[PDB]
């Protein structure tokens, strides 16, 4: 396992950790999710190209498409949340408590 794959997985772990920190700005949560899918795309593309799995060249595009669709949904949700409060701050969603 070369160092490039390790760097990509480290990048994904950093994006996931930053998503889990939640300083503020749920928009940053969506940004972290998109960084995660970008790292997934890059490493999956590198693995597939390297092993010459010709039919697997389908998979990255599919992934991209689906992930981007998810982003759209998320953005819509964000707007409505903002549409209630005027700002996308995380701490505004304190109505529901365990």
């Amino acid at each position: 396992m070369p160092l490039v794959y390790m760097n990509i997985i480290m990048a994904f772990a950093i994006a996931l950790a930053g998503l889990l920190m939640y300083r503020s700005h749920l928009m940053s949560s969506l940004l972290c999710l998109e960084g995660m899918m970008l790292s997934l795309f890059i490493m999956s593309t590198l693995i597939i190209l390297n092993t010459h799995f010709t039919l697997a060249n389908m998979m990255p595009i599919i992934l991209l498409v689906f992930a981007a669709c998810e982003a759209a949904l998320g953005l819509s949700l964000l707007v409505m949340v903002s549409n209630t409060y005027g700002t996308d701050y995380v701490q505004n969603l304190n109505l529901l408590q365990c």
């Binding site: 396992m1 390297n50 092993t51 010459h52 799995f53 010709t54 039919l55 697997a56 998979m59």
Partner: protein, 105 residues
């Protein structure tokens, strides 16, 4: 759980994309076609458990083809020893490895 509709109906919804050695377009081979072919043939019908204990040789060869850890380790050892001898001064690479060879078609 898993409802094997494809086998019941003979549809082949996604089995064409599962392995490297399954009818690539224009007969383009995978990098590890032979190793995967050998490992699959060895483990067919044996089952996963007996397959895991008994087809270990073919799976190890397949993994070595896929990731090539042993090959890079051997190459790195050779290069490290070559660097040691070239810093000590008892080894000189031939012109072939210096760019002074006669290239062939």
């Amino acid at each position: 759980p898993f409802f094997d509709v494809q086998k019941r109906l003979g549809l082949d919804l996604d089995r064409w994309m599962t392995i490297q050695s399954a009818e690539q377009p224009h007969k383009i081979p995978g990098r590890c076609h032979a190793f995967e072919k050998e490992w699959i043939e060895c483990a067919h019908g044996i089952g996963g458990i007996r397959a895991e204990k008994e087809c270990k040789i073919e799976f190890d060869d397949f993994v070595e083809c896929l990731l090539r850890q042993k090959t890079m380790k051997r190459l790195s050892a050779i290069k490290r020893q070559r660097d040691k001898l070239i810093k000590e001064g008892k080894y000189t690479p031939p012109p072939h490895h210096l760019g002074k060879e006669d290239p062939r078609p």
